[model samples]
Target: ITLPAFHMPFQSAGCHPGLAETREAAWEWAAAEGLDLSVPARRKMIRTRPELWISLIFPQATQAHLDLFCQWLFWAFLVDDEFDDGPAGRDPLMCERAIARLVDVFDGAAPNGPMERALAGLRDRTCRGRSPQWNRQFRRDTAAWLWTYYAEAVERAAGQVPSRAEFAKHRRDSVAMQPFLCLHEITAGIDLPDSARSLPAYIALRNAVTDHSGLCNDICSFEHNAVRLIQRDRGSTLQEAVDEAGIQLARIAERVQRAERELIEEIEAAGIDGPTRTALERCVRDYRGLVRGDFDYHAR
Candidate 1:
C-alpha cells in the first residue's frame, strides 16, 4: 500500500550484457579467496548476487570494466559481512585496526592478511595504467568507506539505534554509497574535474543521490531499517511504518530530480564546456541510472 509509483521523470535501468560470465567469475573469485565457508555467509553471498547488482549498475560498462566491478563488489560485500557477523562487528578497536590494513593497501602497502591480498589484487588491476587522479579518487573514497565500519562497530558495541536524522547520514556511508558513486567514474571513463565538482550544485546532487540511494535501501531492507526505527519509535503498525518510509523515499527522489536539473543548469552557468563538462554530465547520468538500477536490483 505504501509503494508509490516512481515519478522522478527519468528512470533508466538495465542489466549487464555480460552478467552470466561475470556472475560465475565473481563467485569463483570469492571461493578462491576462501570466502563464504559458513552456511549463512554462503547463502548471503549467493543471495547478494554481486554480479547481478553490478550488472544493473553497469549497463554502460565495457565487459572488462563490468568484470572488475563484479569482483570488487563481491570483495567489498564480503568485508561488510565480516563486520556484521564476525568478531570485528562488535569490537571497535579490532575493527579500527583491521580497517587500517585495508586502507594501507591503497597506498601500495604490502598485503597483510587474507582479505588484503585479494584487495591488493583488485587494486593492482584497477590502478594499473589508470590515471593518477582516478586512482587517488578511488583510494580516498574507499579509505573513507572503510573507516565508516569503525563508526558502525562503535555504535554496535554500545548497542544503540540511531535517530532518523543520525541514521540517514550513517546509512549513506554504511551502505558504502560514496565509494560506489565514485566508481561511476571507473565503470565509465570519467572523473569529474575539481572545478566542476566544487560547484554547490554538484554537491547537492551528490548528497541527493546518496539520500535517494540510502532511503530506498531502507525500504528494501524491511526490518532493521529506518522503517523499523520509525515504527518502533512511535509504536506504530508495520503498514504505517512502511507508509512513512515510502513517503520519505518519494520525497527524497524529488530532491534527486531537482538536484540533477540544478547540476545541468549550473553546468551551463559555470561556462564549463568540452570534455570536462562531458565527464560531469556523464557522471551525473550514471548516478541517476543508479537510482532505478539499485531499486530494481533489490526488487529482483
Candidate 2:
C-alpha cells in the first residue's frame, strides 16, 4: 500500500548533528540495561532509527539534552513494544497491571522492573530543573497515556474497533503528545508562562500538532487499527481510506498553521513580555518542527 503525503510545508527540517552519537549511545545504554531481548530485535530497532524522529523534533538540542531525550525515546518505545506486540495487548487485567507498575514512576514510586527502572532513571534526569507544576502536568499526561493504553488493550482483547471520533479522542492520549510538549520546555529551557499555556488558542495549537503527529505516524506505519476504523466507518476501499486519512491529516496541518499564527497574535494582544512572547512564538516553530521533522525522518 502507498503511504499518504501529509504536505507539511515547513521551511526547514534538519536532523540533529549529534544524532549518530546519541543513537550509538542509546544502543549501548539498552545493552547495558540487559534488556536487549535478541540479536534480530535490536537489529530491527536500530534499522528503523527510532531515535531519529526526536532528533528532528529537537534538532537544536544540546549534546547532553539530546542524550537525555534519546534515553526517554528509547525507554518509552521499549515500553510500547512490550505492550503492543505481545500478551499485554490481548489481556486486559495483565495489561492494566503492567501499565500501573510503570505509571507509578510518575507518582514518585520506586520502579519494579527493568522497564520501570529505565523510565525512573529518565524521570530523574528529566525532572532535574522543572517546577512542581511542570512535573505534575507531565504526570497528568502520563496518566492520560496509561489510560488510553488500557483502553486499547481492552479493545484488542474484545476484537473491537472504534469509530473515527472515538479513535480521535483515544489517539490523542495514546500518542502521548503532551508529554513531549512538556519535554520541549525542559529541553529548550523555556518553562512557559501559565497564562500563555492556558489560552484556548494555545491549547488548540497543541491539539492540532498532536493530531498531525499521530496522523503522520498512522499513515507511515499503515496502522491497521486506525485505518480499519476509517475504512469501516466510511465504507471506503483500502486506497480510499488511505487518501481520506491523508485528507484529515492535511486539514490538521492547516489548522496548526492557522492556530499558531493566531495564537501568536493572541500573545501579542494580551501584552505578554518579550521573552515569553518570543518563547511562545518559538513554541510555534517547535510544533512545526515536530510534524515536518517526523515526515522528513520517515521520508527516508
Candidate 3:
C-alpha cells in the first residue's frame, strides 16, 4: 500500500508521487473535521521517525498511549543494540523488574481504556520473550532514563495539560542527546525464514513515520497555541492556525530527516543485510519524498 505524506517542513523537498491523492484526501478530511488537530499530534508518529517521536511524546505520555510507546520504545532500543552494555553498564534483571513495576503503576489505571489493555498485551508479549544478553544494558539504562524523565516531565508539565507538559519535559533533554542515549531495543526477531522480516521492518519504519507525522500534528497545535496566546481576543482564525501549524510542521520534518539519517547510518555501520537495508531505505526515501515533496522513484 502507498504511504502517507511526510510533514510540511519538507514541502520544498517534494511529495511522494505514488501517494499524492491519498495523502491529500487524509489532509483534506482532517481540515474539514476541525478535529482539534495539532501539527505534531496529527500524524501516526511511531512508524517513520521513532527517535524523534519517542522523545517528543514519552514524557507527556500517559496510560492511554504508554503501551504503544513502550512497545515501540522497547523494540527500538532492542534493535539498536543499546542493551548490550556488559555487566557493569546496565542490568537486564533490573529492567525486567521495572517492567513489572510499570505494570503495577498502570495495572488498574486504564486512563486510556482500550489503549491500556493494549499496552498490557504488549507487555505480556515482550516481558516473556527471552532477555537477550545484548538488551540487558539498554533496558537498564533506559529504565533509569525513564525514571528521570517521569519526575522531570511531571514538574515541567505542571501548569500545562498534564500529558502535554509531561511529554515536552520528557523530550526536552533526551531528544538532543548523543545517539546511543536516544535509542531503544526490540524483542521481535528478524530471522524468520518464512518471509523477509516485515514485522520488524514495519516496526522500525512505522516508528520513524509516526514520529515525524506526529510532530507535524503537534507543531500545528503549538502554532495555534502561540497565536492564541499572542492574539488574545483577536486570535488567528482556523486557516491561519493551519498555516502556522504547517510552518512548524516543516521544522519538525527537518529534525525527523536528521534523526532518520543517523538511525540508518548506525544500522548500516553495523553491517546489516542488504534486503533489510533496501526495505528500510525504500521506506525512508518514500517518507522523505512525502514530507519534503522531493520524489524521484528512479533515483535509487
- TM-scores of all candidate predictions against the true structure: 0.91, 0.93, 0.34
Candidate 3 wrongly placed segments (more than 4 Å): 1-121, 130-211, 219-242, 257-300
After superposition, the stretches of candidate 1 with alpha carbons farther than 4 Å from their true spots are: 1-8, 34-36
Candidate 2 displacement at residue 140 in angstroms: 1.7
Worst 10 residues of 3 by lDDT: 291-300
Q: What is the lDDT of residue 27 in candidate 2?
A: 74
Query: Which regions in candidate 2 have their CA more than 4 angstroms from the true location?
Result: none
List the pairs of residues colliding in candidate 1: none
- C-alpha lDDT of all candidate models, in order: 0.77, 0.77, 0.38
Tens-digit lDDT track of model 2 for 51-132: 7877888888888888887877777777777778867866899989888877777667987767777777778887866787
Q: What's the ranking of the predictions by TM-score, best on top?
A: 2, 1, 3
The TM-score obtained by model 3 is 0.34
For residues 1-300, write the lDDT of model 3, one tens digit per residue: 112233444433322232323333333433443333334443532234333333232322333233344344433332222222323115545534444454443333342333234444544444445344423433444454445434433343353333433443343323312112222223112222213223444344434444444344343344113324323434766556545545544555565666567657755665756656664555455444433321121111
lDDT of 2 at 242: 83
